[PDB]
Amino acid sequence: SNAMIDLAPLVRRLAGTPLAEWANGLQAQLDTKMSKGHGDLQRWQSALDALPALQPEKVDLTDSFTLETECDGETRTVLRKALLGLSPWRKGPFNVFGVHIDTEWRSDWKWSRVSPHLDLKGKRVLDVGCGNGYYQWRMLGAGADSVIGVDPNWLFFCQFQAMQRYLPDLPAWHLPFALEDLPANLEGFDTVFSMGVLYHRKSPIDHLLALKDCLVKGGELVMETLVIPGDVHQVLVPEDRYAQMRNVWFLPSVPALELWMRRAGFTDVRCVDVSHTTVEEQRSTEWMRFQSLGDYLDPNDHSKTVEGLPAPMRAVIVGRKP
Amino acid sequence: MIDLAPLVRRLAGTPLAEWANGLQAQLDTKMSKGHGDLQRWQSALDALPALQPEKVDLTDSFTLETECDGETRTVLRKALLGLSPWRKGPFNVFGVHIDTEWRSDWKWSRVSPHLDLKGKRVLDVGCGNGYYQWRMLGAGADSVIGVDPNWLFFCQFQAMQRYLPDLPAWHLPFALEDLPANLEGFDTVFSMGVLYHRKSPIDHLLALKDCLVKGGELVMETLVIPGDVHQVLVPEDRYAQMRNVWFLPSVPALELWMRRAGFTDVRCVDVSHTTVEEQRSTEWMRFQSLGDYLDPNDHSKTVEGLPAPMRAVIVGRKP
């Protein structure tokens, strides 16, 4: 009972690009996936159905995600309650007609540091593991021609739908697919982002190659992942959990990761941003009640996780497809 | 002591009347036996603030609302945490979100549209903390009795009943075998998450059938495997780290067993493969959960190499 999405505008937008053939089959693939996901989608429909009919008088996506319109107290209460029905909210924050979706992450802080290193104007962008799509909006704010996000999580998809309701003309799409669901050798995006995915992949090199295969020649990869201090030979694989997370594989040093990207065939490879993640930028909130960074750090030594491993440190590395 | 007089009144004139007239004495004795167990949770129950809801929703969720300041909410939260671990739920209790291990709300949404509970006398076998009992009233049930021989589950029900004291739901800390034979007094009986723990799945089905009036309905949920009518898994040792797991039939095998037990109009209404979004450790349930029980390299298997948890809901009628 979630409406089907009309992809005809996406098909129109991708005509005359290497993405055209793929776009021509997306409507069928999306329709099938949403049929199969009907049960899961029902979990969030009452929340989506309760979102009030409002249109922004003002939109900013360049310095934040902020939507403004004339909205009374009663309407704001309805909106706030509907949005809370889509919790937990991880990437953000979103300012939605005076409702502050105070998400787990200050994704805006990180974006602010990365964006000045990139020229997105006129580019077709893919965001891999996009979560709720927060960054897709910001990539439009930085001038992207179009942004497609992929993440096979229905709640993330519904959080994107909530925002797209109020931004229905903008060229951003969220596809509830895994990266492996894209065809081989798509080679159609100008820029690809993979933020927070590499450390969950058994095969980091295959991940890098899959991202390269998404890019046009001359395209750009922006890779963010968990790293450790040290030289080119230092690579951590946890015995069990890392910051209480399962399925954590390789945590290379920055020089190790740069070398792997060169072996995967990227050029102009360099780190643009490194930092230890702070409890100020990642924490539980009213909108994301579950445990968060502070809970996963050694309570006596914030430089270590509860397992005694080096605490979360993220690097952003940029490279080009030669 | 818990006063069962309103239950006795509610059941007068039904086939459950005679049994109800013996319940208070049985409960009192069971609670004597369980005194030592019950003491563990008394201070937490005693710490629950005196509050009464201004708004109650049991139909679309479990949500209770009232005027409550931060200091009372702090006391409420601490008391409720004293009853950890919380498995079935979630409960929204005056702004305190009991984020339980299970999204039992999701499962309820998959099951309830297939059932008509309006005006029915319902028994919930293996009710855990009684979450679904509240939802069954939300769905129009005249009354719900839950049975589960676990003292913590009993105390978790008491915690919610404190705030919903006039609703016709009761939790009995009994095993199904503690009910007399041939009660034949319920319109609908639920057995959710029990069959796989029974050495005798057929005796379980017959015991459930014996609780029902003629024309009554059994809602059966349990762990299953893929395959045809001949596929039946019994683990060599553990299944998803659990001891005492016996039969995991295929859906067609389970339907056949239900027909052999004498049910008619037997049909599977839901099949789902349990995900870590539906079952997980939380601040309210800190012990291990589903993600720890799956093969970390192949989530289609348990850590033992067996097919990963798959649940089926099957409905049948007593002829």
Side-chain angles (χ1 to χ4, degrees), chain A residues 104-168:
Chain A
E104 174 184 17
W105 281 88
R106 296 301 307 255
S107 308
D108 61 334
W109 297 352
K110 189 271 302 314
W111 180 251
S112 189
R113 299 197 311 275
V114 171
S115 192
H117 294 279
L118 312 176
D119 179 16
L120 301 177
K121 294 191 221 72
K123 307 290 184 60
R124 297 184 304 280
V125 185
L126 175 68
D127 190 13
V128 176
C130 57
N132 60 24
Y134 172 76
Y135 297 103
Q136 305 181 229
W137 305 115
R138 303 305 312 283
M139 290 159 185
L140 295 177
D145 181 70
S146 58
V147 187
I148 297 166
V150 293
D151 207 315
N153 183 290
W154 287 116
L155 174 55
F156 292 159
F157 178 83
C158 291
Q159 291 172 358
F160 183 84
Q161 287 199 302
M163 296 304 92
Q164 187 167 59
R165 179 77 54 88
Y166 301 118
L167 293 171

Side-chain angles (χ1 to χ4, degrees), chain A residues 30 32 56 70 91-92 99 167 179 188 206 211 226 238 272:
Chain A
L30 185 59
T32 296
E70 174 184 18
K91 292 175 174 165
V99 179
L167 293 171
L179 181 65
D206 285 301
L211 298 168
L226 295 166
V272 300

